[PDB]
Design an enzyme around this catalytic site. Structure first.
Site: not given
Lengths: 252, 30
Positions: A43, A99, A199
């Site tokens: 992502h 992910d 992230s």
């Protein structure tokens, strides 16, 4: 990173900063797994709800960094990407299952006191170390708190792995076989967590058997800062290792 | 490969960082 602290120099020499060429900005964390390959969250590359659809010529990785902003000449290495590989079963439309993404460097990066790869886990390291209550370490340059704030240097935090049933029950979002959760409980006097700018960075555990650091997780959805969540969600790296090895073998 | 996960400024110099003891102490099961 919330309730983290300033990294000692060279504390996580596998830490990588995913960086946008234009405008010049921090996008995400990442990690060095060999002199040619970098791991991040899918992502961070492809997430149209946040207008993210990056190709290899949009991006740089900055390796060996400590300061979030300074040009760290003669320590950091700033690299273009040859190719980006997103997990074929990642589907941003549904959820953040699988992910994960691999970034191939244009050229191998030379190792130094500040640039060195992390180990990938094997079955044994998962069974012995990926256990509820056991702490791993997360590093990144994400925000320090909610906006409704940025660190000057890389932040470090230690986080406990959350019991699978406990994490399943904490949310209505599906916790897949390819995820684990980490974070403190409400009565704890520690409140560490990852935020969105973290992230794609590594959740890493130091082995009590051989003193090696193993990247068990990738930050996928931290609960800190503006999310105001309960537990942070991490891509379970070992569960996706078959794909990782497939790409490296095929395209290395 | 064989060198993975060992930090030039820590493990390779028999030095420890300020909080790795927290991680080690968390391994309590059995």
């Amino acid at each position: 990173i919330v309730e983290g602290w300033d990294a000692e120099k060279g504390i996580a020499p596998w830490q990588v900063m995913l960086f946008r060429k234009s405008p010049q900005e921090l996008l995400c964390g990442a990690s060095l797994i060999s002199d040619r390959w970098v791991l991040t969250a899918a992502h961070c590359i492809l997430y149209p709800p946040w207008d993210k659809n990056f190709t290899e010529n949009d991006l740089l990785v900055r390796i060996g960094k400590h300061s979030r902003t300074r040009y760290e000449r003669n320590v950091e290495k700033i690299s273009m990407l040859e190719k980006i590989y997103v997990h074929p079963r990642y589907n941003w439309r549904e959820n953040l299952d699988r992910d994960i993404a691999l970034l191939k460097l244009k050229k191998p990066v030379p190792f130094s006191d500040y640039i060195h790869p992390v180990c990938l886990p094997d079955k044994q390291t998962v069974t012995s170390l990926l256990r509820a209550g056991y702490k791993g370490r997360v590093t990144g340059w994400g925000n320090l708190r909610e906006t409704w704030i940025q660190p000057s240097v890389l932040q470090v935090v230690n986080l406990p792995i959350v019991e699978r049933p406990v994490c399943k029950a904490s949310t209505r979002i599906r916790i897949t076989d390819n995820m684990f959760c980490a974070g403190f409980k409400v009565n704890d006097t520690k409140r560490g967590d990852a935020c969105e700018g973290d992230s794609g960075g590594p959740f890493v555990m130091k082995s009590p058997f051989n003193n090696r650091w193993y990247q068990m997780g990738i930050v996928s959805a931290g609960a800190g800062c503006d999310r105001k969540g309960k537990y942070g969600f991490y891509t379970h790296v070992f569960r996706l290792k078959r794909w990782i090895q497939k790409v490296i073998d095929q395209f290395g | 490969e064989a060198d993975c996960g060992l930090r030039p400024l820590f493990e390779k110099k028999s030095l420890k960082d300020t909080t790795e003891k927290e991680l080690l102490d968390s391994y309590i099961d059995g």
